[PDB]
From Swiss-Prot, chain A:
The name this protein goes by in its record: L-asparaginase
Subcellular location: Cytoplasm
Binding-site positions, substrate: T80, D81
Catalytic residues (positions): T12 (o-isoaspartyl threonine intermediate)
SMART domains: Asparaginase
Classification lineage: Bacteria, Pseudomonadati, Campylobacterota, Epsilonproteobacteria, Campylobacterales
Keywords from the UniProt entry: Cytoplasm, Hydrolase
Enzyme Commission number(s): 3.5.1.1
Quaternary structure note: Homotetramer.
Enzyme class: hydrolase
The species this protein was found in: Wolinella succinogenes (strain ATCC 29543 / DSM 1740 / CCUG 13145 / JCM 31913 / LMG 7466 / NCTC 11488 / FDC 602W)
Length: 317, 314, 315
């Protein structure tokens, strides 16, 4: 039987109207026939309380586990609110082709029709599947396998809240039967340039929410708080309000990296549209979303604040 | 023929004065007696409350005219949803008000603006469009202003109504409705901006892991009367941010919880005790439309219970 | 300059117009490639037949075997573009790009979608990253894997989707980016070879519903069906009277392959239908019309239930 470690971080999956990893397994006992499972509690928080500190601890623990000859995969039980950020971070910091699966539940374990038991059963099946190797970090939810680059929570409450709006799920898992149909062609995991092994604190990156009659006072406050980067969640194709644009221009001139994303939810925040990024000193984040653009910019800033080098990062990963 | 006025405000649809915009689609003149009027000439990413008030008052004046059947507003796609939602609560008429734009400029291969404008005129004159509220007509679809959003950066099909769906269709000018909003709009709205020269300041914050208090603090220092929090998942804040929003709400700045996710309700009685923290739950909107509704709310009250009732009604 | 052949088959993209006229309407493509046009057929795609599929595939294989030729674009009606693209995806013995493109509005229409679609197709066909992506449909600034693509809407310019995956890439004013690729074998890796085939095996499709019938199964058998796709209720479920007739069809050696009418998801093995006891094949993650194409190709080499199940579980 393959050896898998489950790292528990908290989330609604571990809620009762907090449950232990052994008690989550004991609700899905069938799971133990698939794999020799070890559980380890890394954190016990709603994912809305996640920090860079916890991300670093998690990434370094995953790298330690996957470096072990006997350990075939890691599963991470997690809140659904920021699972896309944790998964994207790990996608760029896990130096292994071995499977890493994030899984949660939109309803607590106590709920009628709790989604967590089936999500966890399916997550184990994905984790031990030979075809999961070198797929990158995946989120497994509602019978779907999502590439961490592409995944997002797109609904506040639905069990089917996860989507990959720019590319779709890469595979399915239906009662443990695992099929892949696509794979990411953007570099991940072992092929990532990033290495967080010697990092204790990630660079501060703020996110701003664009709208009509917008302001410069939030750019100004992020700068005053020592932001090394700002993600602008722009209107349509990453467009700013003029007053805000002016403040972002000043921010970029001072060496704070300004990366343009969108509030809209899907699609690329493109280069060579309405914003002259070269003249203003900005990066276009292309086919991400504000919260995952933040993660990539935080990792970019561990080794450069050069606009060209950071545009190449966003145009690669 | 029915009289329709087209108010032009700018946007990629005009990437060109309204006479030459209207002249690109001569067929619209078979449908209606069309007058064009240039209200503004801006990218919708440059819109302000000043232009919204100008626009609403002009629409009201036109629709109060016996002979004016409908108003079409040509507009940038970026903030069309905010302008439509604002008009949906400030236009005191059941006559049709149709917003239309284009994701490609008129110069483009396969420009979408000509068909969109033709369809918009057909929606505006259709008898079934009366009392539907303000609508966005894009990509052969009719979306209720309450429900509509731009969901994609670039696609001609960027508009969606993720919590409902389109209320109707328009296909080479053939108009059909299948649903209608049951949320009050237009003539049934309590809001009246006829005497308002300036809208209350409302900020929007973008929630994430390892969040901050400094942007809440800056909105307060700038004299925000309202803050929309675009929360993680079902409107959840980071604790440091929640503490700052609690301070904001105690100071009499209205804090309304929405979500960054894109769809679904930011619900009451989930993980956030709104009653104890003094917050409003914005329910089935999105941050940018919740901002519009909070701006209108603040024109008559800053009371939490009264603003919760507004979000739970409109 | 890359050399590309555009093979015109008809469709509303050409709504009628000659190939050079279609080409002359988007002059920007001539800076991108040396373009040659060829008229293969001039029909709406609702009139497509296996005869045209074979002519097209053999001609695409001839062109792509030429050292001088970088890629082929096929202009096509939208209605059955997914069936032609899927057929070529399993019969084209090259890694060179093959792009299908059409238009939901004719060239004469307000806001005709054909010019941008064709311009974008030419950009996809010459892009270095399009090599070994398999046959693709390029529509509405999207690049769809032929295995996954379907027309999902009657009218909309955005009617194409890949409901089980999603687009593999984007093309926005000619800028080509891939984000994913299929992990199902295609083109040069496919076991199928139609080089000596003149007529494809007859495969019917049946539409399931409550109070269903055995008469259409029987008519297809009488007409010499070599296979039947059953577009079943939910997860490929038949009505009992229909199932009985399908069981008789399978016993007689006509291959019965279960798909679904619903639009998305897999018609799975080991659900409510005992395929092994009944002699059926589960088509898994396709749709009825693409399952028809794969069954027609399967039948050019075997009628064996296990061998055809392995084909559906591979391609
Ligand atoms: N707030 C919860 C929601 C969930 O897990 O569904 C969390 O993200 O931890
Ligand atoms: N930035 C433009 C985009 C468009 O109209 O499509 C606007 O909103 O004015
Ligand atoms: N019936 C046409 C429809 C189209 O091309 O859009 C065809 O498929 O040829
Ligand atoms: N085949 C079952 C499927 C279900 O209920 O989920 C039925 O329709 O009765």
């Amino acid at each position: 039987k393959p050896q898998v470690t489950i790292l528990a971080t908290g989330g609604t999956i571990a809620g009762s109207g907090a449950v232990t990893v052994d008690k989550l397994l004991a609700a899905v006992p069938a799971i133990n026939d698939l794999a020799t499972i070890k559980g380890e509690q890394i954190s016990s928080i709603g994912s809305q309380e996640m920090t860079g500190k916890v991300w670093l601890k998690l990434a370094k623990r995953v790298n330690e586990l996957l470096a072990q000859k006997e350990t075939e995969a890691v599963i991470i039980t997690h809140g659904t609110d920021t699972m896309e950020e944790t998964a994207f971070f790990l996608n760029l910091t896990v130096k292994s082709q071995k499977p890493v699966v994030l899984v949660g539940a939109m309803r607590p374990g106590s709920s009628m029709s709790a989604d967590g038991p089936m999500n966890l059963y399916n997550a184990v099946n994905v984790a031990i599947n030979k075809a999961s190797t070198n797929k990158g970090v995946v989120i497994v939810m509602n019978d779907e396998i999502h590439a961490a680059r592409e995944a997002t929570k797109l609904n506040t409450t639905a069990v089917n809240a996860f989507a990959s709006p720019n590319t779709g799920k890469i595979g399915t898992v239906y009662y443990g039967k695992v099929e892949y149909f696509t794979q990411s062609v953007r570099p991940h995991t072992l092929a990532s340039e990033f290495d967080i092994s010697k990092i204790e604190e990630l660079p501060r990156v703020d996110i701003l929410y664009a709208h009509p009659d917008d302001t410069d006072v939030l750019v100004n406050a992020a700068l005053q708080a020592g932001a090394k980067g700002i993600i602008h969640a722009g209107m349509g194709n990453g467009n700013p309000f003029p007053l805000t644009q002016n403040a972002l221009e000043k921010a970029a001139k001072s060496g704070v990296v300004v990366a343009r994303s969108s509030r809209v939810g899907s699609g690329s925040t493109t280069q060579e549209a309405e914003v002259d990024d070269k003249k203003l000193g900005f990066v276009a984040t292309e086919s991400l979303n504000p919260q995952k653009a933040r993660v990539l910019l935080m990792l970019a800033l561990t080794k450069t604040s050069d606009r060209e080098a950071i545009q190449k990062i966003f145009s690669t990963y």
